[PDB]
Design a protein around this ligand. Structure first.
Ligand SMILES: CC(C)(COP(=O)(O)OP(=O)(O)OC[C@H]1O[C@@H](n2cnc3c(N)ncnc32)[C@H](O)[C@H]1OP(=O)(O)O)[C@@H](O)C(=O)NCCC(=O)NCCS
Ligand SMILES: CC(C)(COP(=O)(O)OP(=O)(O)OC[C@H]1O[C@@H](n2cnc3c(N)ncnc32)[C@H](O)[C@H]1OP(=O)(O)O)[C@@H](O)C(=O)NCCC(=O)NCCS
Ligand SMILES: CC(C)(COP(=O)(O)OP(=O)(O)OC[C@H]1O[C@@H](n2cnc3c(N)ncnc32)[C@H](O)[C@H]1OP(=O)(O)O)[C@@H](O)C(=O)NCCC(=O)NCCS
Ligand SMILES: CC(C)(COP(=O)(O)OP(=O)(O)OC[C@H]1O[C@@H](n2cnc3c(N)ncnc32)[C@H](O)[C@H]1OP(=O)(O)O)[C@@H](O)C(=O)NCCC(=O)NCCS
Ligand SMILES: CC(O)(CC(=O)O)CC(=O)O
Ligand SMILES: CC(O)(CC(=O)O)CC(=O)O
Ligand SMILES: CC(O)(CC(=O)O)CC(=O)O
Ligand SMILES: CC(O)(CC(=O)O)CC(=O)O
Lengths: 405, 417, 402, 407
């Protein structure tokens, strides 16, 4: 029972620190209203928040979970590309973006796939990772810890501790690397339908404390020593995989290439080899042998409540194209994405709008009866949509249509 | 007037009911994406596509919670998204004040990752009590790297030699710059692969990120180059040598967009009280994680803790291209002992390829403009073209440093989990 | 020698077939040199290229073709290298001035600091063929099959039947659409083992073909090994011998032998070997000059010098140590040392002499693989000595002056 | 003096008051005797005393070696030298010397030369030429390092440093500068021509002089190291691949369909299929930066050892992208190209000063300095290396395509 003004006067005098507003204020929306008012007086243009919406949005799912010092929300247009004829099913793919032509392009690639009998995909691997950096007094000591971790006995004991932290966290393997007295241990584990970063970090924490029982001299320098690797480009993710590794493929009949894509199979292939393979090689790329996988990955991620910062590594992709058919005029295309970091429960997937987009795809929440299937399905959809996107952009580049917008 | 009338009578030119438009669309074959053409309002076209979509979903009511009402679609249509079915609200938090180059910024961050804003805000606090941060823009130029092809490598080599002459460069520059007042071809980096020739055009672009502007200018320069070498085949305006939205050593080494460096010294006291650790611990974690760890992982440009988190959050809030986080996140963060007792913490973050702009694309939408205005960098800087974009790049580099400081502190103190 | 040239000028008898028709190796080389001479713009150029009094019998048929002589490479010695409580005299073949002297100086600092310690972390030569199935769905199936205990068992049996040392450790598989890259890894006794692994790979691929007849074997080497090309896979997974060595150099030794301080050494190490290499976009090149040491020892010991591309992979680390943090701790980690003590150039007498000097010539019969492992440790230890000295010279500003 | 004492007396004296041993040539009169005594001293420290019995040392010119190419010398290592050729390149025919102990390498390279010759020859071009050195310097603050970078980028700034750099030698001409900041650190890549010399020494001296001049403008600058690994020398690095180092070269040739079948024992189509999936796709899957080839390192290394080059530089000199394509009236002939951006090579200085390696350089007609066109001999050698690599790629790739590698 106070006025917005009084609460403001109460905060200005170091008493309630801006970020603690919802802790005291009744309405979540009012707490946001008040923070915007404090913010106004610190801006060279006080009315700069006028166009930033905040009213009538469910903050209950956000506060204490997805964002701090909330001042509103940012609307990102959502378009739909589809149907994506994938694995004998049809999907309507939601895409959150502000880049014109991206939805139209992806939709067109979907069209060429649908008229071609559809695409097929497979999940090759599933395991989120965490790569802590640990340190022993000497390299001879860290060497000893690596050999121990490499024994079936050592692996058994740390797996017991890792798995003891969650019903869904199942340690699959360990990849260890030495740098003198430093030891990088790459923990790889299943995580149900969650992307798993949190669950994996906890497992690593418990597993490391257990390892410490056997080697008291070991110093745990950081639970993440950048050997995961999370949100930074790294050859290890490309070569070893991280999260879901998947492959997609489709054959686009010669006539579909000409009618829908406005180009030829031979042109498509020539551009692919010389842009996505040779071009990427000349640029010194590790994992970027594709046209614009990141665009598709980013749009689906924002629409489906994923962690968009993970587009850095989730975008890794190699797109291949070759002649197919009795006459060799049809287009075979494949996209291989070894490190899709994705999930359908927790984080932003907890928010209603993002859940709507996930429901649209039929992968919302946990898959009881088959843990991880909702996340694996979303990964396949991502890989398939990337392929649809690749098909369209490559067709435009081959035809000299990138100009069109 | 509803109970569906026959299609013939339904031929429109308010006009008709939803059921009838839906019937016309299904009967004839007006794909859902052309709705805004016929419909009097953008919102009704959206409402209809949504209704058409529901019928194709296994859970028809899945769109229930996907908002769509009361949103300016006129700004979206024809420039930002097609086949629109609504919008996705991303929570926006604020970290500040960020004390950068004697100014104070309130940095908006759009995210769904808990603690990211709190952590960036904490780093800002340490920077502020440390007397502020300073930054410099080292280079500025967007790029496009087309792949071109000649009959033989001796021919492509000939084109490369020609492009490297002051004579040939001037002619190409002329054609390139004629594309617009802001297109100013700075330089050319060429790479040969047998008979293929990769040409990296680089140029300022005012306050725009410049992707479209540079592409058009590149298309005209190649047109001009083709006059001199009619046997040259333009294989693709983008042959992945730019490089756009894919990890590439070339962006790390040559830069792309804005190259920025930032720095600050955090007093030993502020490291203990605000960051909950010591200078020595921060340094030991920095070297072994950001340098050695990244090296062991085979990273090119990923010598940092979480620049991508900061870049992505600001990008989404300010109408940038979030897919550009791939290369924009490139960053190396260094930490070192500083001061009298060597107990203070020197830190710097160097980001060679921030791809950013304050005009065009998503920056034309109102909510994003509000976030750009909050920073005082919205739209073009008529008096000093490109200054608003440069300023935003400096802010992005500064906020990344604040983020790096806080996460690294938590890692050193064991506060991540 | 004069009348023989006549015959060769006529068809049906190429220059590379001379040894088969002549009674002496040397004479064969001599005639080839005379034949070659007539085609040179400067016929007398071969005047200083030696060829006499050399054992070609061991070379021809296994080490080189169309032989016209030999190339002498100066061999110097650096040591003693005090490693794992032993003392080694390291032979180094080079034409680079100051290299042996620098390496010798690094050995000196290490010996005055009580020696170095090393450990072999892994051992396994690899081969990475590329096969292809009709569809990615089929490739995915072959990958899944290979990952089952049943599938791995059958191809391991086939692989291991090609040799007593062919003992398949594991498979790392990567998919690229319908292509499938399979990385076979195995111990190989004391041989570098490229030949053995390749043959074991061929037999296993045919076995795999019996289970998947639609599988096309594109190449025994699809560049996934990876042999003699820079690749992150070798850096991350290892190839050949993965080794780590270390030592602590007393502050006094850093000053008197190395002419610098521990602090300056550390600053140069971090900013050159860590930060510089990062700015240059290096994958695996986090060192000063490991390649120099690797190359000289390889040439001296009959190794394959072309393998210095991957074998030189190294991360050199330095930090303050001891009671007053003034002593220098240094470590060198090399994950992909491709080496051997039997086969190829190691069958030649001069190179066998350099190998014997190290006590690692030939096979270790009572403990197969121990001679190659010991040599790998010597290489890593010597690289560390080389790193110490060059880094000291860069810190004190003595590179050019030396 | 020394000749009046016996080997045993010298040994007893070296051990007596501890003479290093690397100093034996200071004491003893003849070069060969200093080597003999070092061998004797060393032998007593070996688990097997006679292990040096087969390491030759006699009848070798040590005068050219001592004080220039090696120290603490105990002999020399003979590397068999074979010849591949003729290599028909740019309307000329080269007989290529290759020092190797790897069986089939010379045969295979000779085979590829055969295919090229029957195809009308190869063509090559030198795209760029400039040795580099990339020192690391440090300023008190990032703002200061930014200032140095901006200064080096001005024409005035570049002119003064170039004057200082070039003042170092008649053949040292600074071409360009590439800079990179890392906080308060500044990495400056100096790139310069160097006549026919590989240039590392010359380039390093010029850099030293240029940095001392830069220090006049920036007294607060600390020169941390003359090589901050930004060159980059003898370590794999994307900068060499993208920017070039030494000589950037490209080579090409078309092999008639008949020749592919008869000489190479395979098919044009098979070759292309193997090239794409091995050299492009495979290298990509392996995370390669610059290794988009089959075995350029084998050829580079063999020619380097035979011609007195620095074999350690095979690390970056091997960088190569091999491309293959269908060509001709019926799309049945084989177009192949190899592009090598960073061949570090020279024909003057170092081991290039020894007679045996000078003989191999003379074979190619590239020994020493080109009087009328400084650098032309080194450039010709780089063209030959690239052409020979291409010959080598042709043969191994044919063998891999036909299932012939292991025999
Ligand atoms: C815009 C573009 C799709 C135009 O399509 P087009 O092949 O020239 O010709 P059409 O307009 O007849 O349509 C072809 C197909 O595209 C799709 N498409 C075209 N315009 C569309 C739009 N505005 N909205 C949604 N989907 C669209 C349709 O699904 C399909 O036609 P149909 O299903 O009605 O039979 C094409 O120029 C393109 O994809 N450009 C490349 C964009 C790109 O990838 N850039 C980088 C990412 S932004
Ligand atoms: C959550 C975290 C910020 C709290 O740290 P802390 O030092 O124990 O918290 P404190 O209560 O002592 O406050 C210290 C500072 O944190 C910041 N801060 C803390 N909680 C905050 C919140 N809810 N919202 C905004 N800012 C917050 C403030 O700027 C500052 O406090 P102040 O108002 O007194 O000036 C810290 O644990 C952290 O940063 N974790 C790492 C998160 C991360 O980077 N992980 C990956 C990205 S999500
Ligand atoms: C040439 C260099 C070794 C001389 O070092 P220095 O410390 O200035 O000279 P010193 O007379 O004090 O000798 C110090 C130590 O160096 C070693 N050393 C010096 N000259 C040597 C020589 N000519 N031969 C062999 N070993 C030598 C000795 O092991 C040791 O002395 P000691 O064993 O007699 O007690 C040194 O400047 C250096 O290593 N430069 C760097 C070279 C380099 O790494 N470049 C790249 C590869 S070539
Ligand atoms: C061994 C190999 C050279 C034989 O090739 P082949 O075509 O089947 O054998 P041929 O007798 O038909 O000769 C074909 C050509 O090879 C070359 N050649 C064959 N044996 C040779 C030898 N011993 N010495 C020199 N050149 C030889 C010839 O130049 C040429 O024949 P010609 O000049 O007499 O007309 C071939 O199998 C090969 O190159 N394998 C791959 C080796 C490789 O690159 N591995 C990795 C590097 S070591
Ligand atoms: C076209 C592209 O730049 C992506 C985009 O425009 O959003 C990617 C490419 O380089 O092909
Ligand atoms: C902590 C980190 O995983 C990022 C995040 O949690 O969002 C990055 C790292 O330090 O590896
Ligand atoms: C000194 C060095 O160039 C190697 C050499 O000269 O033989 C390596 C470096 O430190 O860059
Ligand atoms: C055959 C090869 O290994 C090189 C060699 O054996 O000398 C290279 C390749 O991977 O093709």
């Amino acid at each position: 029972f106070l006025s917005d003004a009084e609460i403001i006067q109460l905060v200005n005098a170091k008493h309630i620190p801006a970020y603690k507003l919802e802790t005291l204020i009744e309405t979540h929306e009012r707490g946001v209203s008040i923070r915007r008012q404090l913010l106004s007086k610190k801006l060279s243009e006080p009315s700069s928040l006028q166009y930033l919406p905040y009213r009538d949005y469910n903050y209950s799912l956000v506060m204490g979970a997805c964002c701090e010092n909330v001042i509103g929300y940012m609307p990102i247009p959502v378009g739909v590309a589809g149907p994506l004829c994938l694995d004998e099913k049809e999907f309507q793919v939601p895409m959150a973006t502000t880049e014109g032509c991206l939805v139209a392009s992806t939709n067109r690639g979907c069209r060429a796939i649908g008229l071609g009998g559809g695409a097929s995909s497979r999940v090759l691997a599933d395991g989120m990772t965490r790569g802590p950096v640990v340190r022993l007094p000497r390299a001879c000591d860290s060497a000893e810890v690596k050999a121990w971790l490499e024994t079936s006995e050592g692996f058994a004991v740390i797996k017991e501790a890792f798995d003891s932290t969650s019903r869904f966290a199942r340690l699959q393997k360990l990849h260890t690397s030495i740098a003198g007295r430093n030891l990088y241990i790459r923990f790889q584990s299943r995580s149900g339908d969650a992307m798993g970063m949190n669950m994996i970090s906890k497992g690593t924490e418990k597993a490391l404390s257990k390892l410490h029982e056997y080697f008291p001299e070991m110093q745990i320098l950081a639970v993440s020593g950048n050997y995961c690797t999370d949100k930074k480009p790294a050859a290890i993710n490309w070569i070893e995989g991280r999260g879901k590794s998947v492959v997609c493929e489709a054959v686009i009949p010669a006539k579909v290439v000409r009618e829908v894509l406005k180009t030829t199979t031979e042109a498509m292939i020539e551009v692919n080899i010389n842009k996505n393979l040779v071009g990427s090689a000349m640029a010194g790329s590790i994992g970027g042998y594709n046209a614009h996988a990141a665009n598709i990955v980013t749009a689906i991620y924002i629409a489906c409540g994923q962690d968009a910062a993970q587009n850095v590594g989730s975008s890794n992709c190699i797109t291949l194209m070759e002649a197919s058919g009795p006459t060799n005029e049809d287009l075979y295309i494949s996209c291989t994405m070894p490190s899709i970091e994705i999930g359908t429960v927790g984080g932003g997937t907890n928010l209603l709008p993002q859940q709507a987009c996930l429901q649209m795809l039929g992968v919302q929440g946990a898959c009881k009866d088959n843990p991880g299937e909702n996340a694996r399905q979303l990964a396949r959809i991502v890989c398939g949509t990337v392929m649809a996107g690749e098909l369209s952009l490559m067709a435009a580049l081959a035809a000299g249509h990138l100009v069109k917008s």
